[PDB]
């Protein structure tokens, strides 16, 4: 059994090295079959399948019984959505839940039973799966007649369970929670004290006066004063809340000013600073944990390989075979194996082993495939001329000319009648510029080779853009037959292809926006954008979870409360025609929650839902303002600060 | 001879500069040292600060007099127009004070330093321009509409504050990146305008022509019309919302906070750098004083008797001065070395804690329990509980009397409860004074605040009981009493620790935010004066309005007819809410070319209010933690 244990130790070294490369903790059980199961489960295919299943189970909310498949979200104009049959979404959800159960079983087998019991995330996964399956069985025993599906609230949790960055962000929020709670208590005391002071201050005065008007409009009773001051805390009705009092007497504004100085200025920014105080070393801590995990992986692999000899160390042949069996990029794998081959038969110690496995911190520069060579001197000279970077200068100049022409002929044509436009010069210029784009793409492909041209991301991007523009232009020319003087390119019922062509042609500006890191001031902005996109998961997952949970709650609460009866106050929900901001389906719920995250016109929604669904509904919206506009927006600002100050 | 006096006076002034963290570039002569001590005295600095305050406050009583009860154009009475000579004589007195200050600054420091210092050259230029403008405005009989000299007033404040010169130096360093972010935001606006004009106009309300599209997108950038700008399109099709959403993601959320990040990247170690510079100045001052005292002797060292004479002359806190003097006495007649001299002046960093006077020391058997109970914080918690009960009673009587007019009925029970609670407050104050002594009780700022407020409450309650129950109405004096009780309820914040820590943090932030306050004052002053010069009499109440217009919302009080109304209008514009209402109003009244002023105000005001202020709060919060 010596050979069996030898190959088992080789497999242990391989899996430990793979964990070190992928920054995975070494806590899973190491067995003959468990190693194969671990390498199969953490493969790219299985992880992509799990992520797609999570995406599908989140996307099912768009196709549930409150279907989100209508052209418009306005209550007045929306038609009945396509209601899916009972078994369709239930079957899709049950297959997603079976996939999740398989994933949970694999996770619970790869790790120990003790680890599964001790881990709170796996216990929560099991509880959520059991509750979701029970709710699905209940909702299927009745024939899709359960109005509220609690399982839909637990769908975001899966997204939390399969993301380490999301869990780190949640932990940072948890750490920031006590100071935020203390500041919130102070702010509630502030709100209550100013509410009582306002109610007592605007109580007197003559009838129909400015002070009496202020009392009637905003500070009549305690809940209305509380709502008014809470909205003023978000500065959503800053002039309206004080216009009557400020017109009655000039000094009253002082009061409101003090409020905005204390509540909206000091305490909200204090909350922002508190939330940022926990994301202060986010990226640095993540890098430190990644390096620590890599070091642990390499150390454990060395320790495993050392026992195979029984001085301590790893034989070069065993390390070479392990590197041969390790899933790694070609450059790093080849460099590491050549460095191992450089060592003779002498055993490798732990320190030199770790220094060898420090080669994985090298950012390999991928060389673009060489351009094909042409024997003809004229052909190769033309290839050199067209492959020169000054050709990109000429292309950018022509692109700027195209963009300026499109903008000018859009501004000019806004004044003239919609049916008397000529669009001849603009059509000719667009045709010429699209032909030039096609010629430039063909020349670049000729000079750099098809694979070489497609190697660059900017080159493939502009190639796709010019292909789409060429298709649109050819279709337009085929429909409208070679523009002439007075060539109207818009016809009723012809999809308005001209507008689509000009809108896709306005994506040219990326040719100039992608070269902004050239100037020094824009370099830090570009670095911040890149870091925020790389760390997009940290805030994006929290955003998705919050929006999903609150959309489901709103649909369960405010499904059919806003109905237009077949005169309204000037500042009301009906007069502004906000009927499209309802909770009748998932997309409308998401748009309404977005419009509420932007605290503007918050009191309009508050009053509308107080009148339609009840006075207590405000609580929900208040919670929304606490969860999205206060916690998540400050989280995004903290991540922006961290990504800006990381490199700098 | 007199050289000994000169040396000891130079040592005294150097020690004072080290204590106050000032430079040593000032000339040190017999007369110059006396002038330096007089000029940097507390009296002269307070006088200069008050003169700056007065010259800034004169804008409230200028020709557009801000002396009307209301700011509504419909109801505003004719303001009291001051005579021609009054505010001109006050301003010329302030300018003469500033000229004296500038001459003293140019005399104490070298003429070469004055020539090389750009701030002093700017001070001289501003003073000369202000005097010329004042003479011109006085040659005419106060008939110059625009006073250019009024725009240069805030500079005086800016010239006197050293903290503002550093917050401006940091803003100057952050300007190259804020300019790039502004260029990116302008590109964002232009691209989304030229895209919406194709998407929607190809509508009549928000994206009809180029100026309307630009204004609509800029307002959405400030999120002042977020649902309104999208309702006409989001009603036609859901996907259109995506467009606006993308905008709000790119401009309002990302770039407007990238501005905050850019500003904070410069204030990252502002407090630490200031502290290091202050310590360096203190060390340099102590070193210069040591060198002077060593030169006085005639090895190198400070004679302890000379050092005691210097400390005697030095204006310093009694505790630190006595500690240093007794340390020098303990040194005896031994000559002090350079390192010992440097380490001697570390006593000022001891941060001496103020002690409280002892308890009255009454008899034990009869009053020991009383002393223990009243001195204990459980009595303070009982007082807080009773204050909360008073607050609950006020809330109950507000809620029950909300349906009817609060002034009508149901105030007898509230009156009795307030009388009982004020009696309890008086009893608690008397018991605390008994347990701590009058000077002991007044030592604590919370205790003196509580005592003052309960004295005011008792006076008002007794007056109301005597006059009515048997000038102001009964309801007005009940409003005053209830508002004073609500204000008194603030005592619960220092007591409760979770609120007390946050209150202390907020107070420390306020104490360190004076540079932000000065910058805000400068910006508000300049923009208010420009708005008065531009939009003075444009908004008039014609003797029907659209539902969401300037007239239907009755925003008439937000005008620029006077300085206070200008300040309130600039405040209401700083809070970007309902920005489009003012934009449309002044477009219709003052002409199309008025959005430039409001856009410049939005930039200069939103930066200060959101990004610079958040950067300062971040720095101040992280330094303490
Ligand atoms: C209306 C609109 C909406 C909003 C919007 O505008 C207005 O917002 C605007 C914000 C724009 C982004 C800003 C900046 C970048 C990064 C850039 O990435 C260069 C490639 C990376 C590597 O480059 C080297 O890679 C290879 C090695 O030689 C060569 O191959 C290549 O030639 C060479 O350059 C850049 O990173 C490295 O260089 C950085 C330099 O600073 C360092 O920092 C950083 O640390 C470092 O890794 C690619 C373009 C992109 C995403 C822009 C797209 C357009 C926007 C989204 C606009 C967007 C449209
Ligand atoms: C998001 C929705 C709320 C949390 C849902 C899961 C809770 C149960 C669970 O699974 O909790 C998971 C953990 C439990 O603790 P720990 O991290 O030590 O467990 C793992 C320990 N290990 C790493 C050693 C294995 O707690 C959390 O991470 C969440 C803590 C509470 C956050 C509340 C945030 C409320 C405002 C959110 C605004 C956005
Ligand atoms: C999208 C971007 C929009 C942002 C625009 C406004 C936002 C912030 C506004 C910011 C608040 C608006 C008020 C700012 C008013 C500035 C007037 C300064 C007059 C002083 C003078 O005459 O000379 C300027 C002085 C001369 O001393 P110097 O250092 O050369 O020698 C050494 C002397 N020292 C060591 C004592 C300092 O330079 C400075 O001390 C540097 C900073 C002061 C002005 C530079 C930029 C100020 C902020 C940006 C202005 C708008 C931008
Ligand atoms: C207008 C409001 C929109 C609100 C919209 C609400 C409706 C929701 C629509 C569906 C959203 C679907 C989210 C995508 C799901 C997904 O791809 O999840 C997988 C990733 C992987 O995350 P990871 O960082 O690779 O985790 C690794 C941890 N292991 C697996 C090793 C344990 O996990 C992630 O962290 C992916 C997060 C990506 C989120 C991007 C933002 C999307 C916004 C749209
Ligand atoms: C909205 C305002 C409209 C316009 C209103 C106009 C009339 C009201 C004007 C109020 C401000 C008047 C301030 C006059 C005194 C002054 O100059 O204060 C300076 C201090 C900061 O002084 P410092 O920089 O700490 O001093 C360092 C030592 N030196 C260099 C002096 C030797 O403080 C400052 O820098 C200014 C702090 C101001 C108070 C906080 C903001 C209040 C608002
Ligand atoms: C942030 C929000 C706005 C994102 C929403 C994304 C999707 C949920 C939306 C975007 C556009 C919508 C589509 C717009 C138009 C139509 C055509 C519509 O066709 C009809 O016959 C509608 C009813 C009718 O008019 O008769 C069916 C729904 C559908 C596909 C909609 C389905 C839901 C979509 C994909
Ligand atoms: C924390 C809370 C509970 C107390 C502190 C809140 C402050 C914002 C208060 C404390 C004193 C208040 C002031 C007390 C008295 C007056 C005079 C008052 O004058 C009139 O109403 C006279 C004209 C008329 O009644 O028609 C206008 C409000 C004002 C300035 C108040 C404005 C609001 C102030 C500054
Ligand atoms: C900074 C944070 C911590 C502030 C949190 C404030 C909330 C605790 C306040 C603000 C608005 C308040 C609400 C304002 C109005 C009402 C209606 C009120 O009911 C009525 O108006 C009575 C008539 C009826 O219910 O029909 C019940 C309390 C409630 C929900 C309030 C509950 C407490 C709320 C959510
Ligand atoms: C941020 C802003 C709101 C601060 C404004 C502060 C001052 C410029 C204001 C606050 C209260 C005002 C006072 C309120 C009431 C009066 C009584 C008023 O008496 C009248 O007879 C007015 C005309 C009339 O009603 O007949 C004269 C102006 C005066 C002192 C006003 C002068 C200007 C004051 C001091
Ligand atoms: C991120 C920052 C740097 C963006 C700055 C953008 C400004 C330079 C733009 C945005 C809004 C623009 C304004 C939008 C609308 C108008 C009205 C427009 O009016 C007309 O000339 C047509 C109507 C008429 O003449 O009656 C004149 C230009 C102006 C002031 C524009 C001037 C340029 C402004 C201030
Ligand atoms: C530099 C900038 C200009 C690039 C990014 C701008 C985006 C906000 C644009 C680019 C493509 C646009 C989309 C192009 C086409 C459509 C289909 C369009 O469909 C209809 O209007 C059909 C139904 C109807 O008209 O009733 C709705 C807007 C939408 C999703 C657009 C939404 C806004 C988008 C995402
Ligand atoms: C291959 O092509 C180029 C290469 C390089 C540049 C530019 C190029 O292309 C153009 C040249 C001229 C006009 C248009 C495109 C820049 C110069 C540059 C700097 C800032 C700019 O900022 C904007 C201007 C307008 C709109 C948006 C941003 C734009 C260009 N160099 C400094 C580096 C290499």
Distance B170 CA to ligand 12 centre (A): 29
- A210-217 vs A238-248: helix crossing angle, rounded to 10: 150
Beta bridge partners of A346: none
Is B222 in contact with B576 (CB distance < 8 Å)? yes
Residue-by-residue DSSP string for B187-198: HHHHHHHHHHHH
Is B286 in contact with B205 (CB distance < 8 Å)? no
d(CA A470, CA B239): 25
Distance A207 CA to ligand 9 centre (A): 21
Fold (topology level) of A524-647: Helix Hairpins (1.10.287)
Exposed e or buried b per residue across A562-574, where buried means at least 16 C-beta atoms within 10 angstroms of its C-beta: beeeeeeeebebe
Contact status of A193 with chain B (Cβ, < 8 Å): yes
* Identical fold between A170-276 and A524-647: yes
CA Rg value for chain A: 32
Q: Cα dist. B211→A157, A411, A499, B188 in Å?
A: 47, 10, 21, 15
Q: Is A320 exposed, middle or buried (0-12, 13-18, 19+ CB in 10 A)?
A: middle
In CATH, what number does B508-624 get? 1.10.287.70
Task: State CA B516 to chain mean position distance.
Answer: 7
- Give B166-266's CATH code, choosing from 1.10.287, 1.10.150, 2.40.50, 3.30.450: 1.10.287
d(CA B406, CA A508): 66
Q: Which tokens hold the place of A562?
A: 């806003």
Close Cβ partners of B125 (under 8 Å, ≥ 6 residues apart) = none
- B474-488 vs B377-400: helix crossing angle, rounded to 10: 140
Is A231 in contact with A602 (CB distance < 8 Å)? yes
Residue-by-residue DSSP string for B516-563: HHHHHHHHHHHHHHHHHHHSSS---------TTSTTTTT-TTS--SSH
d(CA B500, CA B376): 18
Contact status of A491 with chain B (Cβ, < 8 Å): no
Contact status of B621 with chain A (Cβ, < 8 Å): yes
Nearest CA to A550 out of A607, A622, A614 is that of A622
Beta bridge partners of A314: A348
Query: How was this structure obtained?
Result: cryo-EM
Give yes or no for residue B297 CB within 6 A of ligand 11.
no
Q: Tokens 């400070």 sit at which residue? A: B302
Find residues 576-615 of chain A whose CB sits inside 8 Å of chain B. Answer: 576-581, 587-588, 591, 594-595, 598-601, 604
Give yes or no for residue A251 CB within 6 A of ligand 7.
yes
Q: Which CATH class is domain A377-514?
A: mainly alpha
* CB half-sphere exposure, A54, CA atoms < 13 A: 20
Report CB contact under 8 Å: B224, A269.
no
Helices (DSSP H) in A449-516: which residue ranges? 450-455, 457-480, 497-505, 510-513
Q: Which CATH class is domain A170-276?
A: mainly alpha
Q: By alpha-carbon position, which residue is closest to atom 25 of ligand 8?
A: A615
Q: What are the backbone dihedrals phi and psi of residue A64, each rounded to the nearest 5 degrees, phi first? A: -75, -175
Cross-chain CB nearest to A522 (options B69, B180, B399): B180
Find residues 292-321 of chain A whose CB sits inside 8 Å of chain B. Answer: none
Torsion from C-alpha of B359, B360, B362, B368, nearest 10 degrees: -30
Largest CA distance in chain B: 96
Distance from CA of B614 to the nearest CA of A (A): 6
Is A544 in contact with A445 (CB distance < 8 Å)? no
- The three-state secondary structure class of A564 is coil
Q: Tokens 């297959």 sit at which residue? A: A95
d(CA B577, CA B85): 41
d(CA A104, CA A123): 10
Report CB contact under 8 Å: B493, A189.
yes
Resolution (A): 3.0
Contact status of A246 with chain B (Cβ, < 8 Å): yes
d(CA A555, CA A582): 9
Q: Tokens 């042949």 sit at which residue? A: A317
Q: Cα dist. B534→A495, B67, B538, B542, B594 in Å?
A: 49, 20, 9, 20, 9
Report CB contact under 8 Å: A270, B506.
yes
DSSP conformation class of A348: B
Distance A226 CA to ligand 8 centre (A): 7
Is B131 in contact with B94 (CB distance < 8 Å)? no
The pick from A180, A192, A193, A223 for probing ligand 8's pocket by mutation, whose C-beta has the most ligand atoms within 8 angstroms, reads A223
Cross-chain CB nearest to B226 (options A264, A410, A598): A598
d(CA A318, CA A297): 17
Is A110 in contact with A29 (CB distance < 8 Å)? yes
- Give B364-495's CATH code, choosing from 1.20.950, 1.20.120, 3.40.50, 1.20.1740: 1.20.120
Helix (H) or strand (E) holding B114: helix B111-116
d(CA B625, CA B621): 6
Distance A458 CA to ligand 1 centre (A): 10
d(CA A95, CA A89): 10
Minimum Cα–Cα distance from B406: chain A residue: A203
Contact status of B138 with chain A (Cβ, < 8 Å): no
Is B120 in contact with B114 (CB distance < 8 Å)? yes
Report CB contact under 8 Å: A277, B622.
yes
**Domains of chain A: which residue ranges?**
43-162, 170-276, 377-514, 524-647
d(CA A241, CA A236): 9
Distance B600 CA to ligand 10 centre (A): 11
Is A588 in contact with A580 (CB distance < 8 Å)? yes
The pick from B22, B40, B514, B562 for probing ligand 5's pocket by mutation, whose C-beta has the most ligand atoms within 8 angstroms, reads B514
Numbers of helices and strands, H then E, in chain A: 30, 0
Report CB contact under 8 Å: B258, A648.
no
d(CA B206, CA A113): 62
Contact status of A645 with chain B (Cβ, < 8 Å): yes
- The three-state secondary structure class of B302 is strand
């Amino acid at each position: 059994g010596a050979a069996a244990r030898w190959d088992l130790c080789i497999d242990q070294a391989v899996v430990f090295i793979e964990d070190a490369i992928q920054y995975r903790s070494i806590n899973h059980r190491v067995d003959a079959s468990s190693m194969w199961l671990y390498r199969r489960y953490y493969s790219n295919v299985c992880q992509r399948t799990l992520s797609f299943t999570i995406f599908l189970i989140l996307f099912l909310a768009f196709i549930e019984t409150p279907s989100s498949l209508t052209s418009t979200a306005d209550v007045r104009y929306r038609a009945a959505p396509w209601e899916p049959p009972c078994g369709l979404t239930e079957s899709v959800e049950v297959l997603c839940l079976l996939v999740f159960a398989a994933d949970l079983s694999v996770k619970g087998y790869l790790f120990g039973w003790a680890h599964f019991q001790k881990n709170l995330w796996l216990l929560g996964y099991l509880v959520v799966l059991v509750v979701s399956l029970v709710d699905w069985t209940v909702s299927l025993s009745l024939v899709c007649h359960e109005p509220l599906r609690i399982r839909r609230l637990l769908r975001p949790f899966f997204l939390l369970q399969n993301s380490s960055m999301m869990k780190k962000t949640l932990k940072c929020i948890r750490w920031s929670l006590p100071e935020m709670a203390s500041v919130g208590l102070l702010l509630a005391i502030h709100l209550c004290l100013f509410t009582m002071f306002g109610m007592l201050l605007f109580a007197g005065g003559k009838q129909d006066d400015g002070q009496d008007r202020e009392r009637l409009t905003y500070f009549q009773n305690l809940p209305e004063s509380l709502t008014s001051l809470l909205v003023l805390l978000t500065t959503a009705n800053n002039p309206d809340v004080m216009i009557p009092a400020y017109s009655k007497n000039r000094a009253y504004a002082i009061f409101f000013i003090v409020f905005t100085v204390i509540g909206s200025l000091f305490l909200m920014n204090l909350l922002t600073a508190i939330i940022y105080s926990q994301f202060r070393g986010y990226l640095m801590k993540s890098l430190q944990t990644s390096l620590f995990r890599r070091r642990l992986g390499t150390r454990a692999a060395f320790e495993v390989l050392s026992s195979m000899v029984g001085a301590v160390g790893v034989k070069p042949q065993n390390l070479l075979q392990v590197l041969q069996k390790v899933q790694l990029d070609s450059s790093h794998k080849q460099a590491m194996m050549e460095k191992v081959r450089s060592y003779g038969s002498v055993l490798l110690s732990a320190e030199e082993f770790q220094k060898l496995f420090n080669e994985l911190d090298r950012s390999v520069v991928k060389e673009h495939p060489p351009r094909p060579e042409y024997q003809s001197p004229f052909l190769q000279s033309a290839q050199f001329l067209f492959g020169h970077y000054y050709f990109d200068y000429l292309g950018n100049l022509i692109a700027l000319a195209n963009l300026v022409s499109i903008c000018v002929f859009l501004v000019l044509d806004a004044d003239v009648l919609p049916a008397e436009r000529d669009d001849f010069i603009l059509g000719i210029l667009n045709c010429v510029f699209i032909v030039y784009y096609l010629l430039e793409m063909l020349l670049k492909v000729f000079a750099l080779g098809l694979r070489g041209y497609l190697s660059y991301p900017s080159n493939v991007f502009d190639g796709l853009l010019t292909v789409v523009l060429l298709v649109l232009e050819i279709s337009t020319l085929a429909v409208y037959r070679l523009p002439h003087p007075g060539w109207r390119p818009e016809m009723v019922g012809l999809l308005s292809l001209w507008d689509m062509t000009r809108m896709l042609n306005m994506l040219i500006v990326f040719r100039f926006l992608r070269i902004i890191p050239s100037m020094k001031p824009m370099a830090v902005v570009a670095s911040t954008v890149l870091g925020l996109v790389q760390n997009m998961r940290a805030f994006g997952g929290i955003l998705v979870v919050v929006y999903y949970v609150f959309a489901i709650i709103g649909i369960n609460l405010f499904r059919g409360v806003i109905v237009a009866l077949p005169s309204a106050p000037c500042g009301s929900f009906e007069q502004l025609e906000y009927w499209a901001n309802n909770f009748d389906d998932f997309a409308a719920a998401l748009v309404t929650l977005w419009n509420l995250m932007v605290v503007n016109n918050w009191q309009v929604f508050l009053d509308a839902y107080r009148r339609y669904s009840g006075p207590w509904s405000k609580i929900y919206f208040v919670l929304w303002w606490l969860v999205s506009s206060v916690i998540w927006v400050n989280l995004f600002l903290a991540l922006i600060l961290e990504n800006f100050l990381h490199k700098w």
